[PDB]
Amino acid sequence: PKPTKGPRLGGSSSHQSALLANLATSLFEHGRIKTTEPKARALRPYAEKLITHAKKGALHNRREVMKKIRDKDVVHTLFAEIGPFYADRNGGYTRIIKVENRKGDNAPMAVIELVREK
Template sequence: MPTPTKGPRLGGSPTHERMMLNNLAAQLFEHKQIKTTVTKAKRLRPVAERMITNAKKGDLAARRRVLGQISDKSIVHELFTSIAETMAERPGGYTRITKIGPRPGDNAPMAVIELVLEPYSPKQATVKEAEQATAAAAAPAEETPVEAEVVDEAPAEDAAVEADAVEADAETAEESSEAAEEK
């Protein structure tokens, strides 16, 4: 168990602080994000991430450990089924804290702490994708002049066909005007 923090605690006694953080963690897992003070969010982050790490293990001992902290079985079930599956590939950093403006009543600094539910892509995969994209961009660049020549020929043929069509229309118009003059 981690050493209690020195100095003033969030709720007075260490037991009250631990219970408050467990309740905040339960609300975080239920609603996927909560708005609280920056201090509580910073203290909540390791508690919530430890619970998610236990949920990723998925065994009975881990479930009992989390049930010792969160008494609501439906939230624990959601944590072990949906949240743990979402975080399976992520090695850590399951939560994100975003600071927002101060609270109107007492001007306390507020923050939103939320679960990071976006799919995880490791840096190596990102680098490989970037290299593949660069290679793919370079390969069509080599082929583009060939395609450009083909594309250049096609409009020339189309222009010739269009010119013939314009001449045929002009001839048809002349014939119709001559026929109208004869009448």
Template structure:
């Protein structure tokens, strides 16, 4: 669990804060989404994400480390068997905090913290156009073909490479 911050600790001492965050994490893993104050949710996020990271490892040591924080074996079992496989491809950001408004009694900012269980869509990296790379390759192969031509006359492969080189050279002159 991250080191407790200095100053007020959510209305109690450090032990009370640790127990409250453990109970909030257990409720989050049980219900997949909970409604709480913004301050508690912001304090809960690193704790919950760290526990999910341990669950993704899935070994006995990780299970025991999660058991140190959450004492309920059924919640830990659910975390390791149901939640961890759903976020296996995700590299972080397992929780989402959405603001809901203010509580009527004390005007505290209320949020909904939920687990992000949707599958990850990989980002497509933009690459350079293939046409820009093709002339470089054709220029390198063209001299080798010319060197091999006298030794092997009328090789069909050499003629194909030669035709490609001519097309590339024609494109270069058109571009200029």
């Protein structure tokens, strides 16, 4: 999606790409993760577009997801439950909740999770 305006997350572009991939894998594996607020803000569109790929789940879309996810159990779950679950929802598959600041460095924390209402 839109690239970051300022300096990249992990300290480099490659580290940011790996960070986003790992965070998306963790989110799809657990359903909700806790991290710094800017990380979740960057994670939302990335994970949502992966879910969009999984929604119209064909072989081509599967390979599109695998060229980012790298974990096969998460790919299977994404294409067997997560995709079908969001079949009739148009966008907004995740939500971000702000939580209390970290203690060691006063880093603003947030929780990103998949919506489960319908």
